[PDB]
Amino acid sequence: MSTDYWLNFTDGGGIVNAVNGSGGNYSVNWSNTGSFVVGKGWTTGSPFRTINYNAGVWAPNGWGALALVGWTRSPLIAYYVVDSWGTARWTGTYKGTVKSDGGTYDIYTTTRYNAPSIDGDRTTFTQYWSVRQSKRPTGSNATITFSNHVNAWKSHGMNLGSNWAYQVMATAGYQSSGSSNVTVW
Ligand SMILES: CCC(=O)N(c1ccccc1)C1CCN(CCc2ccccc2)CC1
Ligand SMILES: CCC(=O)N(c1ccccc1)C1CCN(CCc2ccccc2)CC1
Ligand SMILES: [Cl-]
Ligand SMILES: [K+]
Ligand SMILES: [K+]
């Protein structure tokens, strides 16, 4: 199932020059950013999708991350499977680990309020995280078997909503700079 969605969002801070490439490819060059997310993916996420990507350029600085990102509604939940990043001190509620796709991931949950979401500029939502314990090598084909994460989260009481919104292999950042180029299928 080929990608059919182009995510390109920023809060307006700094520069986020995002390029909608051929098929599932995209490029990002960013500097002195506020909050942003960019990437190719799917209009409707699925808990059964296996996501393939190749991040041919990955050079983040600060809290810039290479991650599967997506949302559900009912309830409103943002989720993250983080494979690499620049500098990022992960902290919060911690639920265990999951092994997937040759790596081990730390599981976190966080809450946001008065915060931007796909529902508006000042909303409340929960965030589910799988954060790889070591940064994943980039430049070769990589898989994220997302059902492994959904199921691990489920086993710790982190259930996703029933209405699936976008699901993107993204470059996401906050107060960050860098360069990335990723193909997604
Ligand atoms: C598991 C995810 C995660 O770890 N986080 C997170 C939470 C929500 C949304 C995005 C990322 C961090 C939580 C803690 N903050 C510390 C920031 C800070 C440091 C020093 C003084 C004042 C503030 C940074 C983000
Ligand atoms: C402290 C880290 C941080 O703040 N972030 C982050 C999270 C994970 C990995 C790297 C950076 C941001 C979290 C929020 N998203 C925007 C959410 C959104 C999407 C669509 C419409 C409206 C809002 C951008 C990145
Ligand atoms: Cl995001
Ligand atoms: K294009
Ligand atoms: K751990």
Author numbering: 1 to 185
Study text:
Fentanyl is a potent agonist of the μ-opioid receptor (MOR), with an affinity of approximately 1 nM and a potency 100-times that of morphine. Custom-designed ligand-binding proteins offer the possibility of both detecting and counteracting toxins such as fentanyl. Following the placement of the hydrated fentanyl into the binding pocket via PatchDock, RosettaDesign introduced 9 mutations to the Fen49 scaffold to optimize the protein–ligand interactions.
From the SSM experiments, we identified a Fen49 Y88A point mutant, termed Fen49*, that proved to be more suitable for complex structure determination. The Thr87 – Thr93 loop adopts the same structure found in Fen49*-apo. Fentanyl appears to stabilize the binding site; Fen49*-apo Trp63 and the Thr87 – Thr93 loop exhibit higher than average B-factors when compared both with the Fen49*-apo structure overall and with the corresponding residues in the Fen49* complex. The water modeled at the fentanyl tertiary amine was introduced to bridge an indirect protein–ligand interaction with Tyr80. During structure refinement, a strong electron density peak was observed at this location (3 Å distance and 109.2° angle). Refinement with water at this position produced a strong positive signal in the Fo-Fc difference map, and it became clear that the density corresponded instead to a chloride ion. A second water molecule is observed bound to the fentanyl carbonyl oxygen at the designed position (2.7 Å distance, 135.2° angle).
